[PDB]
Write a protein that binds this DNA or RNA. Structure first.
Lengths: 77, 76, 76, 77
DNA sequence: ATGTGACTTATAGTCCGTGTGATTATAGTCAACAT
DNA sequence: ATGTTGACTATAATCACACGGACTATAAGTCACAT
């Protein structure tokens, strides 16, 4: 599938667990379905920037902070 | 509209220019539609990550450079 | 404790008595433990439907007759 | 498995739909797990009088009218 | 060249439900001794 | 006869998650016509 997606997918989960959230909490605060949060983490779904933005707000994290961890995950071995 | 969306778009336009590309050529290079691109640059589109990825390929810019730039752009 | 659970227990005891049964006999007839039965009637047990069902069979009473009674008891 | 159980589980669903509720509303209002409401209807499951009571409160229905519909369902052919 | 508009078609995102391993609270069942 | 106190062990009930189908909103991709 897509390189960037699974990275975006990975980072959303990583943060979520770092903050001791559950998918239920997250989909809560992101005002998306808990099915969608699952869908994203599970099968790296192809979300929209707007949806990503909602998730960032849900993770109680900033644009910047997210993208900084995104860059880190991309760079890894 | 969205704050992020506008700066993604701004960034896309910034890079296209710093490189000296036309929209026509960014569309060709990324195998997407020119009106599609025009839309994004006037910020009338809400890309998916996949699309963004294709535009990065077209701009010939790695994900990292794009995001390094987007961050800087984000901080006024 | 619970209102319903109390009325259920009361009903179980009521029917046992109008039939002149002992607890010992109610437990023999439904193959459950006598201390188990005791416990319900002193309202110290929160039984499951399955258990309730075994007790109805031990009381020789249909589900319907039981609930008809339980409703009436519920209404003071 | 159990005669009465599938009757109880049938009636919980009947009411739930009659009141235009979804499972996960009822799971909230009944102050029980999401998956328990499913599990009760889905298969049958052997609930407790206390849990049944919670569900009745959740269906926004009285002990009495629940049991009245229970009786009616038992009596069917 | 770029910017519209408007018009399909793919798919992102929603909504309601099923099914499941793992853990925790508690009912199910049965001792010993009471009265 | 019934009551009560511990117990052990089955299972009710919880919690975090995956997975599917069907439906709705909207992004993806392509026309025509501006400039």
């Amino acid at each position: 599938e897509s390189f960037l997606l699974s990275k975006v997918s990975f980072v959303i989960k990583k943060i979520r667990l770092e903050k001791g959230m559950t998918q239920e909490d997250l989909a809560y605060k992101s005002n998306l379905d808990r099915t969608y949060i699952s869908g994203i983490e599970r099968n790296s779904r192809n979300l929209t920037i707007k949806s990503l933005e909602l998730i960032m707000k849900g993770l109680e994290v900033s644009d910047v902070v997210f993208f900084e961890m995104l860059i880190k995950e991309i760079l890894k071995h």
